[PDB]
Amino acid sequence: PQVAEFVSEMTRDYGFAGEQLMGLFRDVNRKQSILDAISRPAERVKQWKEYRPIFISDARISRGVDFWNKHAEDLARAEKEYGVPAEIIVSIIGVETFFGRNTGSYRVMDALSTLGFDYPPRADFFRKELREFLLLAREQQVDPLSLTGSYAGAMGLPQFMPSSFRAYAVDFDGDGHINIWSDPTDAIGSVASYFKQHGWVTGEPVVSVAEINDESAESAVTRGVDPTMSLGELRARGWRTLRDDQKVTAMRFVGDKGIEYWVGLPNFYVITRYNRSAMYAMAVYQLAGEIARARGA
Ligand SMILES: [Ca+2]
């Protein structure tokens, strides 16, 4: 019914053959397990002390260094062309999929159709991503049922949503295909492109350890990841850490040895564009640091 509607829209607006599409959707399955996963209540709070070691592990650093050893030239080329550190690219791929170990259990078509048609709270968002998916599959001339992703439709080594693939992904080995699923070279350039296009500033720092004077300084801790003040204003609130005329966020983490205070600079905010969590972005940054250290970068 609404499927027929979506199909009419793809036919009228996007130039798709109605019959070809209906044949496609006959093969698509509704997955109850996806509706359950997206439905889940909030998980128990993890302190930084619990969250960090999920990502900063012997195995994850080892596999990251291995990934870099294997893709060293591609990584140097992406750093040069996009002005984003190699270690940040490697870290994103390590955090998202463990360098291609865990790239999602579903056909993208099943996930996006299940959510687009059968999950009211976010049906519009996923219906849009379904349309973007159909467009990218046509552009790349690949069978739409051949591509995998997470239960929420995120695809390949870097877990790009379909809309991000179309906006930001690149053919980084010049073969005329964009394959972020099994071509690490395209994945590497695609992550670098995403970061440059979300405002990464080449050569600027990302975070700084801080200490505070007084309990009153805790009032400046940022709610969420959007900055509300300059670093100079944050220093006036009693934080000690950099240029003062930049917008920063202020973090208070419960770490392995006690409370840690951190200042997030604009490049930190760029990382949170990938996933809007201060802990996520700190794990990406700290994992990048450890991998770069092991590489001698
Ligand atoms: Ca390619």
UniProtKB/TrEMBL annotation:
<dbReference type="GO" id="GO:0009253">
    <property type="term" value="P:peptidoglycan catabolic process"/>
</dbReference>
<dbReference type="InterPro" id="IPR043426">
    <property type="entry name" value="MltB-like"/>
</dbReference>
<feature type="binding site">
    <location>
        <position position="173"/>
    </location>
    <ligand>
        <name>Ca(2+)</name>
    </ligand>
</feature>
<protein>
    <submittedName>
        <fullName>Soluble lytic transglycosylase B</fullName>
    </submittedName>
</protein>
<dbReference type="GO" id="GO:0008933">
    <property type="term" value="F:peptidoglycan lytic transglycosylase activity"/>
</dbReference>
<keyword id="KW-0479">Metal-binding</keyword>
<feature type="binding site">
    <location>
        <position position="183"/>
    </location>
    <ligand>
        <name>Ca(2+)</name>
    </ligand>
</feature>
<dbReference type="InterPro" id="IPR031304">
    <property type="entry name" value="SLT_2"/>
</dbReference>
<feature type="domain" description="Transglycosylase SLT">
    <location>
        <begin position="1"/>
        <end position="288"/>
    </location>
</feature>
<dbReference type="InterPro" id="IPR023346">
    <property type="entry name" value="Lysozyme-like_dom_sf"/>
</dbReference>
<feature type="binding site">
    <location>
        <position position="186"/>
    </location>
    <ligand>
        <name>Ca(2+)</name>
    </ligand>
</feature>
<dbReference type="InterPro" id="IPR011757">
    <property type="entry name" value="Lytic_transglycosylase_MltB"/>
</dbReference>
<feature type="binding site">
    <location>
        <position position="177"/>
    </location>
    <ligand>
        <name>Ca(2+)</name>
    </ligand>
</feature>
<dbReference type="Pfam" id="PF13406">
    <property type="entry name" value="SLT_2"/>
</dbReference>
<dbReference type="GO" id="GO:0046872">
    <property type="term" value="F:metal ion binding"/>
</dbReference>
<feature type="active site">
    <location>
        <position position="96"/>
    </location>
</feature>
<feature type="binding site">
    <location>
        <position position="171"/>
    </location>
    <ligand>
        <name>Ca(2+)</name>
    </ligand>
</feature>
<feature type="binding site">
    <location>
        <position position="175"/>
    </location>
    <ligand>
        <name>Ca(2+)</name>
    </ligand>
</feature>
<keyword id="KW-0106">Calcium</keyword>
